[PDB]
């Protein structure tokens, strides 16, 4: 049985490879060869947020893209008013090692988690005026790597236990558990329609998942590294990946293969975060070399660099209106670029 | 600036005051990472430091300096990712069962992976070779012999500079010093001086383990001061 099943699996893998190759009518670099270059993009630090004590592990924007949550290993979440640089809330955590945080799209809740293996959902709109734990979603047998709200009642999570999970916040129970990657799941990004989401793991693969029931509709399998960062193209038909082989790769969910590889010989450092601009021409990637690079998502050329950080760029995110790029780093500062 | 904006600024400044009050605590507490296989007595050290959750913050105090000790108790075998969080810790407390010779090679490879990690390269390792009582019983009884697992034990002499405690049987001393030598050999290669290993023979019953960590952290902070204050 076992060897017959392995032969069947290898033949199916070769079939998938053949289909993807058959779909390779042309490369993105060929089709985009005629399009005008983006030119240099000299973004400047408009704000620097000085609140955190320790390394800033993660950040997320509000949908009314003015407020901004950020997490650090000192056990604080700070809700930032990017325009005024004011601190809206400072949330003491019960676990110091928070590795991810999220802002609910309604702006009512903020989730965070880490080595505690607990997704703590915080209610920002309490009548008491304090910020309070609504749920301590527990169930992962490993550290939480990413959390993203689908709505005030559904939060998807990724964990080092190799499995992603969709949670009913009111019930405090996993609505669906997504059959594991081979390794630790490190990044998630919800599709704009919120029906699909894509996950990257420490195995060199990214898996497209259907939220309605946990089937990995597609697995993307080009990388020589662990996928630290993942982000959907704004229309949801493609998603970018980042990994410690110092390459970002753009995958198409309809051609089921990598369109473009963003790589330059001078970049030996791994990639920690990835985000697109609103139009999709700019792919912003954070690197261990303390820099963030702006890539022409179509031409693959580097459009510019955000150079203000003095330690590993840890997290970055583009406002829903595209006005600004936030970048957190282990230097304990968030710098907003525009 | 409107009245509500001024009040928001006042709230921000009152958050900053609290953040400074917490920064004092953050700077005044020494973080420690406790690693070791399930065979290691790290749990017994945690329990005797009596001054599905993936992290177990243990807090203790010696000579008026506060130690936070972190055990990652409920996480998967691989660590190349979550170990990155623990740079900027004072030390890594690595506990290894010195008695179970079958697991010693696995412990040695784990110590290598910890020592040579890209992020930990600046972090010292406090190495508790635990369960020395069991090692004494085992090597005295002769039912299992280290030579069968490490062939070089047949050609290893007790270092002439060693300082065995009273009552030390020569074979016990030789075995424990050979294990220590293996770990120290892993430590000295690729050390580059930026981080150093502090081997200790200990039993999980020993109350002095807190003093060992205190002294080793004092030395680690002393080296960090040497570099920070430009003495070296």
């Amino acid at each position: 049985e076992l060897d017959q099943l392995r032969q069947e699996a290898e033949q199916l893998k070769n079939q998938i490879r053949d289909a993807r190759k058959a779909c390779a009518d042309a490369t993105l670099s060929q089709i985009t060869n005629n399009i005008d270059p983006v030119g240099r993009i000299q973004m400047r630090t408009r704000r620097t947020l000085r609140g955190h004590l320790a390394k800033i592990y993660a950040m997320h924007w509000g949908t009314d893209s003015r407020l901004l949550v950020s997490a650090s290993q000192d056990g604080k979440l700070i809700i930032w008013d990017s325009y005024t640089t004011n601190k809206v809330h400072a949330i003491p955590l019960r676990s110091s090692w928070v590795m991810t945080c999220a802002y609910a799209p309604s702006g009512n809740y903020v989730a965070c988690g880490g080595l505690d293996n607990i997704c703590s959902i915080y209610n920002l709109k309490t009548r008491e005026g304090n910020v309070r734990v609504s749920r301590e979603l527990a169930g992962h047998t490993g550290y939480l790597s990413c959390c993203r709200f689908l709505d005030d009642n559904q939060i998807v999570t990724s964990s080092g236990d190799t499995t992603c999970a969709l949670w009913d916040i009111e019930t405090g129970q996993q609505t669906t558990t997504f059959t594991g990657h081979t390794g630790d799941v490190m990044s998630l990004s919800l599709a704009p329609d919120t029906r699909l989401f894509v996950s990257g793991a420490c195995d060199a693969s990214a898996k497209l998942w259907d939220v309605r029931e946990g089937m990995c509709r597609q697995t993307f399998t080009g990388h020589e590294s662990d996928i630290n960062a993942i982000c959907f193209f704004p229309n949801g038909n493609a998603f970018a990946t980042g990994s410690d082989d110092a390459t970002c790769r753009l995958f198409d969910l309809r051609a089921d293969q990598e369109l473009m590889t963003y790589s330059h010989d001078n970049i030996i450092c791994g990639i920690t975060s990835v985000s697109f601009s609103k139009s999709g021409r700019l792919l912003l990637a954070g690197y261990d070399d303390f820099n963030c690079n702006v890539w022409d998502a179509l031409k693959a050329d580097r459009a510019g660099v955000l150079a203000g950080h003095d330690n590993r760029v840890s997290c970055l995110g583009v406002t829903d209106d595209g006005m600004a790029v936030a970048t957190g780093s282990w230097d304990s500062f968030l710098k907003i670029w525009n | 600036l409107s009245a509500e904006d001024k009040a928001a600024v006042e709230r921000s400044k009152m958050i900053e005051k609290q953040l400074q009050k917490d920064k004092q605590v953050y700077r005044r507490t020494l973080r420690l990472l406790l690693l070791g296989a399930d065979n290691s007595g790290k749990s017994t050290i945690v329990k005797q430091m009596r001054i599905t959750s993936g992290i177990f913050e243990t807090k203790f105090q010696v000579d008026k300096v506060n130690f936070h000790m972190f055990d990652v108790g409920a996480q998967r075998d691989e660590r190349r990712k979550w170990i990155q969080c623990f740079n900027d810790v004072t030390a890594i407390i690595f506990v290894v069962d010195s008695s179970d010779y079958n697991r010693l090679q696995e412990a040695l490879n784990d110590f290598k992976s910890i020592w040579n990690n890209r992020w930990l390269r600046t972090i010292s390792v406090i190495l508790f070779l635990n369960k020395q009582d069991l090692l004494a019983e085992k090597v005295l009884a002769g039912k299992s012999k280290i030579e069968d697992y490490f062939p070089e034990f047949a050609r290893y002499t007790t270092p002439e500079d060693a300082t065995p405690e009273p009552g030390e049987d020569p074979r016990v001393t030789r075995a424990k010093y050979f294990i220590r030598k293996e770990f120290v050999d892993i430590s000295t290669a690729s050390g580059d001086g930026r981080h150093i290993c502090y081997p200790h023979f200990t039993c999980s019953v020993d109350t002095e383990n807190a003093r060992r960590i205190f002294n080793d952290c004092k030395d680690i902070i002393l080296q960090m001061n040497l570099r920070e204050y430009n003495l070296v």
Partner: single-chain antibody
């Protein structure tokens, strides 16, 4: 969440009296707190302010010097020590909480109040003292200000309050268009930089009462005379 004021009673003119308010069920320390008076059978009038952490204190020019506002956060108590009380100081005194951050709703809770019996700023004009209406109708209460409440940051600092008979005022709309928690969508705010309008889109028996406008642009906080709705 509660705010129980205490300290009212008869005071001879020129005397001194200390009001108090026992806060419970919310993070007292985080909230700035206000005292607002209501002269018997008249409109609201702002008295004093003390921010979170007591870093900022404001008083109405009518009470500067006579009144001092203080808070005891560990005891969750707000104090208003009154001295040289005039006859004009006779009013029911409401303790009012407010919290200030982006998207906060100041003045969202008012205590039940305590009665004290004795013996250049922006002025808000409400066009009508009373309006007769029956349930199911739509009512557009209107307001106007002597200075544009639309600040450069885009906020129009107009607040709306409904005081039902025998109750303390309840916040309806905090910025001219933002609807408070627990308020039905029937209430709908609107306005320009200088003229404002509160539309009660489908009146109910619970809506009868006096509707007060308030400005939060400059500090002497000035309430309107109040538009009464009568069944």
């Amino acid at each position: 969440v509660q705010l129980v004021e205490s300290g009212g009673g008869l005071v001879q003119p020129g005397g001194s009296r200390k009001l108090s308010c026992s806060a419970s069920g919310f993070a007292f320390s985080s909230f700035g707190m206000h005292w607002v008076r209501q002269a018997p059978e008249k409109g609201l009038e702002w008295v004093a302010y003390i921010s979170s952490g007591s870093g900022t204190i404001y008083y109405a020019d009518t009470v500067k010097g006579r009144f001092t506002i203080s808070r005891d956060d560990p005891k969750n108590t707000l104090f208003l020590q009154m001295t040289s009380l005039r006859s004009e100081d006779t009013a029911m005194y409401y303790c009012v909480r407010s919290i200030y951050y982006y998207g906060s709703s100041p003045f969202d809770f008012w205590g039940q109040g305590t009665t004290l019996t004795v013996s250049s700023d922006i002025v808000m004009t409400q066009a009508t003292s009373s309006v007769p209406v029956t349930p199911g109708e739509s009512v557009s209460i209107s307001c106007r200000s002597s200075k544009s409440l639309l600040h450069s940051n885009g906020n129009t600092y107009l607040y709306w309050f409904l005081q039902r008979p025998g109750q303390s005022p309840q916040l309806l709309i905090y910025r001219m268009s933002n609807l408070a928690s627990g308020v039905p969508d029937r209430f709908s705010g609107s306005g320009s930089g200088t003229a404002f309008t509160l539309t009660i889109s489908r009146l109910e028996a619970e809506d009868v009462g006096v509707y007060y406008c308030m400005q939060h642009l400059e500090y002497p906080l000035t309430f309107g005379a109040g538009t009464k709705l009568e069944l």
